[PDB]
Amino acid sequence: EFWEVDASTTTPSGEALALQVTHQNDKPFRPVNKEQTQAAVSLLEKARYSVLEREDKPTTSKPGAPFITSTLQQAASTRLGFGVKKTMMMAQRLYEAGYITYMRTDSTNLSQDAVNMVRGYISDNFGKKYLPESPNQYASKENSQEAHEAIRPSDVNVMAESLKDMEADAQKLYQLIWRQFVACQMTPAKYDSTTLTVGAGDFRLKARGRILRFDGWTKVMPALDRILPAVNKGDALTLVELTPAQHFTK
Amino acid sequence: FVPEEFWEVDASTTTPSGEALALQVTHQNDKPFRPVNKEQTQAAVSLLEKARYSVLEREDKPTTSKPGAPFITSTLQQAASTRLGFGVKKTMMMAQRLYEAGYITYMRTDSTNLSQDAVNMVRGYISDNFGKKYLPESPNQYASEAHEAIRPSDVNVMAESLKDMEADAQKLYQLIWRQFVACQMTPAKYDSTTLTVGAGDFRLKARGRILRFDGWTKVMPALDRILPAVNKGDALTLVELTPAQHFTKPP
Ligand SMILES: [Zn+2]
Numbered sequence: 001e002f003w004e005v006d007a008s009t010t011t012p013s014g015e016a017l018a019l020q021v022t023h024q025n026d027k028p029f030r031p032v033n034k035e036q037t038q039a040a041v042s043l044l045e046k047a048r049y050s051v052l053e054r055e056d057k058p059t060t061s062k063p064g065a066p067f068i069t070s071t072l073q074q075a076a077s078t079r080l081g082f083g084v085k086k087t088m089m090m091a092q093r094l095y096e097a098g099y100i101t102y103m104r105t106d107s108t109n110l111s112q113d114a115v116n117m118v119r120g121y122i123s124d125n126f127g128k129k130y131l132p133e134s135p136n137q138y139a140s141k142e143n144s145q146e147a148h149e150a151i152r153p154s155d156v157n158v159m160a161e162s163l164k165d166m167e168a169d170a171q172k173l174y175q176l177i178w179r180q181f182v183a184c185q186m187t188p189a190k191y192d193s194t195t196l197t198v199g200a201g202d203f204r205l206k207a208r209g210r211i212l213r214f215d216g217w218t219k220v221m222p223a224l225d226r227i228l229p230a231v232n233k234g235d236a237l238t239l240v241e242l243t244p245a246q247h248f249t250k
Numbered sequence: 251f252v253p254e255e256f257w258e259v260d261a262s263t264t265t266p267s268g269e270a271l272a273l274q275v276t277h278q279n280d281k282p283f284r285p286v287n288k289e290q291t292q293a294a295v296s297l298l299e300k301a302r303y304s305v306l307e308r309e310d311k312p313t314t315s316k317p318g319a320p321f322i323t324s325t326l327q328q329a330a331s332t333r334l335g336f337g338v339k340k341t342m343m344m345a346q347r348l349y350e351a352g353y354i355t356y357m358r359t360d361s362t363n364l365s366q367d368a369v370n371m372v373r374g375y376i377s378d379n380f381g382k383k384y385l386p387e388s389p390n391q392y393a394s395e396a397h398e399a400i401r402p403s404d405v406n407v408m409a410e411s412l413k414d415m416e417a418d419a420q421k422l423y424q425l426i427w428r429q430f431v432a433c434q435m436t437p438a439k440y441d442s443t444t445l446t447v448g449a450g451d452f453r454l455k456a457r458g459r460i461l462r463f464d465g466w467t468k469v470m471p472a473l474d475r476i477l478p479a480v481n482k483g484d485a486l487t488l489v490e491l492t493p494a495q496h497f498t499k500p501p
Binding site: 015034045060078080142211224 | 251258260288310312329333334335372381421424425428439440442452461462463464468471472476479490491492493494495496497498
């Protein structure tokens with residue numbers, strides 16, 4: 001058996017930052033028993049934590065394409081817990097009430113009027129950094145009347161909340177469709193794929209993930225590694241909790 | 251630090267689709283699982299390692315996380331301890347400093363009240379700096395000597411632009427400022443999933459939640475992940491059981 005110790009800390013600005021104890025005395029931390037682990041905890045409890053290093057690799061996250069039947073079914077399942085049957089049923093009701101485009105489609109195509117309508121909405125409700133220079137294209141081939149279209153809101157100015165006549169699930173499904181559509185025409189989110197190294201007494205702790213630099217499309221559609229609060233080399237952290245756990249090789 | 255009164259045992263599993271699923275033991279023999287020492291934890295592990303894991307139930311439902319009330323003396327001390335690492339005397343001293351300088355309301359109070367002017371002031375700020383979805387239709391009132399909660403005299407004055415206030419007082423102000431603004435913002439909303447699992451004489455659960463709207467957490471960070479698809483009756487592959495205990499900074 002061996003033990004691991006995770007630590008919960010608070011950044012200078014009061015944000016939560018989870019770390020894993022990786023080293024003690026410059027070597028790998030892996031106590032073999034409760035005795036050694038609890039002693040490490042005592043020491044960890046009394047140490048002063050600070051960020052020793054922050055290694056960044058700039059990255060950008062592109063919004064996803066507007067929904068089609070397959071992607072709507074996957075997203076509704078994941079974000080809303082809706083099975084395939086419920087999803088198509090609610091999509092059907094929405095389509096028939098005239099709130100969204102046809103629900104059976106395998107094309108991410110957006111008509112010209114739809115692109116202009118959403119870019120107008122983005123331009124009116126968000127800063128200019130949220131609007132790409134040109135429309136975001138998904139799927140090769142442009143629109144032309146009777147062509148297929150992605151599943152999208154008939155009118156972007158209509159929010160799920162305004163659908164007072166549709167049942168709860170239909171409204172939730174509409175909000176999901178609405179968000180994916182608006183987000184697909186917004187700019188990429190920008191992050192710093194990072195590794196934070198923290199020093200505490202004789203220990204070294206680490207966290208890996210990404211720090212948000214610009215939310216971009218995520219402002220309307222929350223993105224599903226993990227987002228770490230921004231911290232800089234030299235910053236002090238406040239220890240709030242230590243969690244030792246026991247693991248077995250087999 | 252303060253060790254929790256009970257240890258806990260987590261299970262690392264896999265679903266029929268091969269996706270990782272993390273669980274926590276909640277019951278043994280139908281009663282709450284509450285091992286008081288490492289020893290009774292080893293026992294539970296021995297029984298769980300040889301058991302069969304099956305999904306008993308899956309629940310998906312919308313949940314909300316309302317903002318907390320504006321600070322009063324006690325809650326400010328606690329938040330300052332946790333978020334800034336300030337001892338009570340240091341907090342009160344910085345508070346006294348911020349007060350005598352006219353930046354915050356009186357720092358010794360048990361009241362979560364906010365004057366009509368204060369409310370209108372902060373809602374105005376919220377309206378100008380955030381979307382419409384961030385401003386409650388009606389103000390938020392909290393349940394509850396002074397007569398008003400600790401809050402900034404002016405919402406427009408930011409900690410950064412204080413003055414002859416030292417570093418910690420500026421930080422203490424930001425904390426007070428953020429709590430004040432967030433208490434008048436809308437709730438954060440999520441879509442939660444709860445999985446219940448059966449194994450031998452034990453029951454375990456997994457809780458996950460997807461953020462749908464950050465609301466108040468946009469200005470005041472809250473202090474979890476996406477659960478894989480599985481259905482009632484699905485068997486799970488057991489990977490490893492992990493006893494664990496939490497040590498938390500004392501009040
Ligand atoms: Zn076709």
